[PDB]
Design a protein around this ligand. Structure first.
Ligand code: HEM
Ligand code: IC6
Length: 454
């Protein structure tokens, strides 16, 4: 079968289709029009966007396909280096860092992070407890303060103190401006236009800032000798069982940058979308708040209580089904192969997995794909293989998945225990796109149930 292709623009092929405020949503619309696979071409590039579980289940076969660096990741690699997210599987530093960091990211390690996560979550609750009568909450903003601070504290024992400020941290200013430049660079029809020399000069300056600040964090920890139980201690003291080698300081810096990207708006997006869906679905909100009250019987949650917030976990997975905050990942064929018995691929050919569209496959989820129903996730064995991929695939899947879900379950549980929520503006969903997704302008009012934290 010959796969369809969206409209073209002469020699620019499909590239101008990405010069839009909401490229992921544009690609979802194309998938709606063209179906489970379509070719997408740009100058010097060819990829194929997959949206059906039928094909994506084959793409997820690790003997046939390996992680590819998308153009976005190639550009992000300019400041994330050979960190875990931007390295090829065959690079020595991927497997080394993977082996070293897996024990830092397990459920067991979460027991060690829990008290630091609680510290930040309590700050979020206290902020909302202290709002005045008809003030409102800026949801993505506050969730990002929470997520950033949490990775800062658990990552390298650093307090961004985001609840004490409006202006971002200098590192964050440069990181967000660098990520903004990556997105802009994906949209440029002639990236060599001298009109972009200023953007390129700024990009290099923002990389220098990120490197200087993180290199000083590591140098300071090496100069103090302190043994905080955080990711940076683990990276300074860990050795790869395979090679017997530790990570070098350059690669530790890339890992820290990579975690700060992931733990910023990528993770806060999940909380923001989950709270949006809860306030738009009052019976689901009631059910989740009933669980929060039943389980969280102490002034602050224990690790074990967070694990018992089963329905809250289902809420989070159903938010990840509809709006996964890493909306695509790329793959390449390790050898010649045929997809779905119909689409021949040559070794090296690349694929894009359009996750939001996969999660709307009616053959998997039924006709109600657009409704918010956490009960879909009662039983993981009832979900077909590779139908749900918000954390990627295989050995290249999200190392941070337990971290993200634990911190999100904790704070969402605490939010539900301590407040009743009002959608006071009847907020109309507007998904702002960077390299991640957020409900721009989403606001709520939170009325305290007056349950103390002491
Ligand atoms: C809801 C929040 C998150 C989501 C939806 C998410 C999703 C993903 C996805 C889809 C990938 C695969 C990317 C690809 O195949 O190109 C990935 C990889 C990765 N993520 Fe996350 N992530 C989240 C939070 C985090 C956090 C909190 C961390 C660390 C603090 C993290 C660290 C990483 C790393 C290191 C990788 C690369 C793993 C490897 O390839 O060895 N992520 N994530
Ligand atoms: O794959 C991606 C990158 C996804 C993010 C990967 C992880 N991460 C997050 C922040 N840093 C890196 N994005 C899609 C959609 C898109 C197209 C053009 C412009 C923007 C977004 C694509 O490239 O097809």
């Amino acid at each position: 079968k010959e796969m369809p292709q969206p409209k073209t623009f002469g020699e620019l092929k499909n590239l101008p289709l990405l010069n839009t405020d909401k490229p992921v949503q544009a690609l979802m619309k194309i998938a709606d029009e063209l179906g489970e696979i379509f070719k997408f071409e740009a100058p010097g590039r060819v990829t194929r966007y997959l949206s059906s579980q039928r094909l994506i289940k084959e793409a997820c076969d690790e003997s046939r396909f390996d992680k590819n660096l998308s153009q976005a990741l190639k550009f992000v690699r300019d400041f994330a280096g050979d960190g875990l997210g931007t390295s090829w599987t065959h690079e020595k530093n991927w497997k080394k860092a993977h082996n070293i960091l897996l024990p830092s990211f397990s459920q067991q390690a979460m027991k060690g992070y829990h008290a630091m996560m609680v510290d930040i979550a309590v700050q979020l609750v206290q902020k909302w407890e202290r709002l005045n009568a008809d003030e409102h909450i800026e949801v993505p903003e506050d969730m990002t303060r929470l997520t950033l601070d949490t990775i800062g504290l658990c990552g390298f024992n650093y307090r961004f103190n985001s609840f004490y400020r409006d202006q971002p941290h200098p590192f964050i200013t440069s990181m967000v401006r660098a990520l903004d430049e990556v997105m802009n660079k994906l949209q440029r029809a002639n990236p060599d236009d001298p009109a972009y020399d200023e953007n390129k000069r700024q990009f290099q300056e923002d990389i220098k800032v990120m490197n200087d600040l993180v290199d000083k964090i590591i140098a300071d920890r090496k100069a103090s000798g302190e043994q905080s139980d955080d990711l940076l201690t683990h990276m300074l003291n860990g050795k790869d069982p395979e090679t017997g080698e530790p990570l070098d300081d350059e690669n530790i810096r890339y890992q820290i940058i990579t975690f700060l990207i992931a733990g910023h708006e990528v993770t806060s997006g999940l909380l923001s979308f989950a709270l949006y869906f809860l306030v738009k679905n009052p019976h689901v909100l009631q059910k989740a708040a009933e669980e929060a009250a039943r389980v969280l019987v102490d002034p602050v949650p224990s690790y074990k209580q967070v694990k018992q917030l089963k329905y809250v976990g289902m809420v989070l997975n159903e938010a990840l089904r509809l709006w996964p905050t890493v909306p695509a990942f790329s793959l390449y064929a390790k050898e010649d192969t045929v997809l779905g018995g119909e689409y021949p691929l040559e070794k090296g050919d690349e694929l894009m997995v359009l996750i939001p569209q996969l999660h709307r496959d009616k053959t998997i989820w039924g006709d109600d794909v657009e409704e918010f129903r956490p009960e879909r996730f009662e039983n993981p064995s009832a979900i077909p293989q590779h139908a749900f991929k918000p954390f990627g695939n295989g050995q290249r899947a999200c190392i941070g998945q337990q971290f993200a879900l634990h911190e999100a379950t904790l704070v969402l549980g605490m939010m539900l225990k301590h407040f009743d929520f009002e959608d006071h503006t009847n907020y109309e969903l507007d998904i702002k796109e960077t390299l991640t997704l957020k409900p721009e302008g989403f606001v709520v009012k939170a009325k305290s149930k007056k349950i103390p934290l002491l």
